Design a protein around this ligand. Sequence first.
Ligand SMILES: *[C@@H]1O[C@H](CO)[C@@H](O)[C@H](O)[C@H]1NC(C)=O
Ligand SMILES: *[C@@H]1O[C@H](CO)[C@@H](O)[C@H](O)[C@H]1NC(C)=O
Lengths: 49, 49
Amino acid sequence: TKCTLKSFTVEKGIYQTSNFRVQPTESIVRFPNITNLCPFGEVFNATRF
Amino acid sequence: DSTECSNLLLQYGSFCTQLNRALTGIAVEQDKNTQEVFAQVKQIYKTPP
Ligand SMILES: *[C@@H]1O[C@H](CO)[C@@H](O)[C@H](O)[C@H]1NC(C)=O
Ligand SMILES: *[C@@H]1O[C@H](CO)[C@@H](O)[C@H](O)[C@H]1NC(C)=O
């Protein structure tokens, strides 16, 4: 509150300050687990263009 | 939920806090309007039976 009001004194009242959030508890990853390596050798190192 | 955006929003200074102040002035004024309109009576009178 003191930081939000930029003041060391604060009067009788109700003050918005920060906003509470439940923290992201773990970092989930969800991807198509397809096994093939992409054909980039046939993109860049092919015989002719 | 972005710290990166919330850093760039500090460059704009007190815009964000004065908007919350303005909306809080409005929001308290809605209670003030309601108090001024309805709370003109200092006792909760109740009817006879
Ligand atoms: C992806 O993983 C699940 C188990 O987590 C498995 O059942 C599924 O067959 C896998 N898909 C591929 C494309 O390998
Ligand atoms: C293309 O060939 C070179 C060797 O000539 C190799 O180092 C490189 O990794 C290859 N690139 C791809 C995308 O396969």
